[PDB]
Amino acid sequence: LEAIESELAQIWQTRATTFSFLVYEPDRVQSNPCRIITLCPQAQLSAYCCEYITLRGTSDALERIGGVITELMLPTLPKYVWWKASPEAEYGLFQRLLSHADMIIVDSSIFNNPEQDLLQLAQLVNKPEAIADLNWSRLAPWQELTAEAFDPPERRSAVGEIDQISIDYEKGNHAQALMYLGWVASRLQWTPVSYSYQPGVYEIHKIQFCAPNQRPIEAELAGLPLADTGQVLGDLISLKLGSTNTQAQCGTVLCSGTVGCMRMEAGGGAQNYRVQQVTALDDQNTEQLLGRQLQRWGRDALYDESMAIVLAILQLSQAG
């Protein structure tokens, strides 16, 4: 361990001098890239121009040796850190990481059974931090596609009636669905009211909102189990922006698959809604999104506003 810094003098005579990267990798597998430290919970520093600062950490509780790691953070340019395990505060390593590292990146897809952990992540965003979770990047086409329906001037007044929204997502974690719901609510000036839960074969949730006109708002999420998840869990299957009025113009439904078009029954289901179709938007790759998010740096207004509503809803879930 004490040879981590001494051997660097030998490497100094022997390069890539850019921002550094960090990883944790809970998984036991395998046990500008300037300084890659492959932590996997001794020292195995060997720099080969893709300099390697890989340290073999088969023993856990390496916080104490992290004091020199913090000194080995290479403070010359803004840097980035990957924390691909979970959110926590008791483990003191995070506190040192957030103060030291310029920015951190997490993924809202590998979370364990508990769901309130995402709430803990959501709370930290309100405090001034720098989190750019890549799961928000996957909603880029869905958000763009939703805005496509209302574009022409003829449907300008349709947006002022929207009351019913339903979201269909794969059984499991609902982090991807809640983010979309928060986004649309922010753009129409909605506020949370109540939150119930109806467990079952489909896990039908229920959220209610208010409005400037104080008309009731109804939304629900369905956890249709397909049993054919493509290496990624919790992805949208369809959505329906319906209407509950008497002389409303029309709704809008966006199918995504053959089974996802199961909403073509009842009264007006295939009549009161104009059904479109989308080819496929699901199960992307972690590599391509990571590169694009790495390229950009700063603060996003849209993400913070969406996460503001998400915090309010989850705080009422335990009481509701």
Partner: protein, 506 residues
């Protein structure tokens, strides 16, 4: 209204680093009314780095604030609001000022150390951009002095912008090229001339290369001819001296009207890039020529507009305006007939047009298809209605094509109907200023909408005989004249009817 409240903000882009735009020619009350109002608006919505120090330059010098006073002076006459006045305060502190002499080599030494001093004051990144905006005769002396001091040498941190125009004839264009070429590279010189960043022009490529039906029937096997038209309805304003030595052939036919031509007879590029596209524009320009070069009367007609009627109010003739010389010869209406010699446009003539004091402003690119081989459906009106496909780059933007369909009634008949699609009624978004788009691109660096070096030589060579032949002195009573408010002079109509085709009434 409030179109698509879902569209508050979703895009992601950024100009990389700060810089100092050392605007030359701060005098002449043109920078204060054109450039500074443009940049100030962009700063209001945070489209720039935090500090954009502008260093005005002029032979005559004022106080730091007195120079700032005239900067505000031009703001008010084109004011679009100020909001909180504190925004201008930091702006006023951001802008600095220096002075010197244009033709003094040592004057730049006073200049060079000045912005270098501001580099130590700000320490943002260090970047230089030049926007010399003075009379064309000042272009050579300004360029050579920059090379002598050598203060532009970094290929990535130095950019130089040349203002319109660029020359007079073929011998003039080459002379400027030798000076710039020996002292600068090719990835540093920008030549904004056209103001053709209008959004429809870069749409002329996506509509052509991303479809599967519109490509196969675009070649000599189906097309008959092409008519490119540009018209205005504003005469020569009192600044006639600038226009007096220009002529409408050299003003809006060498720079503007040829860009529409290069984008209509070019081959599909292999991959979208910076040089992979502009390299394809040069190839077509190297295989074009006038229809006839011996008898120039078959490939070009000039003209001039005289007194007439425009909008129910009498309009004076050209040789009456406050500044023009009576018994002149500078043309106003120009028409040509170009041909292309390659393996896919052989024998398909192109007709070009332009002018002033025409009935209304338009811009079209009309393509006419051939006639059907068999004529079983003879119908009525001699079936003299071949189907055309017309684009539009003016008010009421859109794409329209005409074709024939059956007329109701027991007897066979053929009417003429068209299906169209307009941008206003499909997207519902207001237009955007083209000038702002070009300035933003001067920071990132693309060199896609700016003409290259060798390409601007080919444009001059194509009209070599026309410019020289008309410039010779001739009889004052030998230039055809047309009334104000009517389309074409009498002579110019005969050029097209000889072949058997008629000008598009439009």
């Amino acid at each position: 209204l409030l179109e698509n409240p879902f569209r508050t903000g979703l895009r992601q882009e950024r100009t990389p680093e700060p810089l100092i735009l050392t605007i030359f020619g701060a005098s002449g009350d043109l920078t204060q009314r054109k450039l500074v109002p443009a940049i100030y608006q962009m700063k209001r919505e945070r489209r720039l780095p935090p500090e954009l120090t502008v260093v005005g330059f002029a032979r005559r010098d004022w106080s730091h604030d007195h120079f700032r006073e005239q900067m505000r002076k031009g703001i008010e006459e084109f004011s679009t609001g100020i909001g909180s006045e504190d925004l201008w305060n930091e702006f006023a502190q951001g802008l600095f000022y220096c002075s010197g002499n244009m033709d003094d080599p040592e004057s730049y030494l006073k200049l060079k150390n000045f912005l270098g001093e501001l580099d130590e004051k700000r320490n943002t990144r260090g970047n230089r951009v030049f926007y010399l905006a003075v009379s064309p005769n000042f272009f050579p002396p300004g360029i050579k002095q920059l090379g002598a001091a050598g203060m532009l040498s970094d290929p990535v941190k130095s950019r130089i912008v040349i203002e319109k125009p660029f020359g007079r004839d073929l011998s003039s264009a080459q002379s400027l090229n030798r000076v710039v070429q020996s002292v600068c590279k090719e990835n540093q010189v920008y030549r904004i001339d056209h103001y053709l960043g209008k959004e429809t022009v870069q749409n002329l490529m996506v509509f052509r290369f991303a479809n599967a039906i519109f490509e196969p029937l675009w070649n000599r096997q189906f097309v008959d001819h092409v008519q490119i038209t540009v018209a205005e309805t504003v005469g020569v304003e009192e600044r006639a001296g600038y226009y007096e030595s220009a002529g409408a052939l050299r003003d809006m036919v060498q720079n503007h009207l040829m860009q529409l031509f290069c984008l209509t007879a070019m081959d599909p590029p292999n991959a979208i890039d910076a040089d992979s596209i502009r390299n394809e524009k040069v190839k077509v320009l190297q295989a074009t020529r006038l229809a006839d070069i011996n008898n120039l009367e078959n490939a070009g007609i000039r003209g001039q507009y005289k007194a007439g009627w425009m909008g129910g109010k009498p309009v004076p003739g050209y040789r009456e305006e406050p500044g023009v010389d009576p018994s002149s010869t500078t043309p106003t209406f120009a028409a040509l007939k170009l041909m292309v010699d390659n393996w896919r446009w052989q024998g398909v003539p192109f007709y070009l047009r332009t002018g002033k004091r025409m009935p209304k402003k338009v811009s079209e690119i009309a393509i006419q298809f051939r006639q059907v081989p068999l004529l079983i459906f003879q119908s009525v009106a001699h079936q003299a209605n071949p189907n055309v496909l017309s684009l539009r780059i003016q008010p009421n933007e859109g794409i329209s094509l005409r074709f024939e369909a059956k007329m109701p009634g027991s007897e066979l008949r053929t009417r003429t109907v068209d299906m169209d699609f307009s941008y206003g009624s499909s997207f519902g978004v207001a237009a955007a200023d083209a000038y702002h788009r070009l300035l933003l691109d001067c920071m990132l660096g693309d060199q896609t909408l700016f003409t290259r070096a060798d390409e601007v030589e080919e444009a001059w060579r194509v009209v070599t005989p026309v410019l020289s032949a008309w410039d010779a002195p001739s009889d004052p009573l030998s230039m055809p004249l047309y009334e104000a408010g009517t389309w074409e002079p009498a002579e110019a109509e005969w050029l097209i009817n000889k072949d058997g085709r008629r000008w598009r009434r439009l």
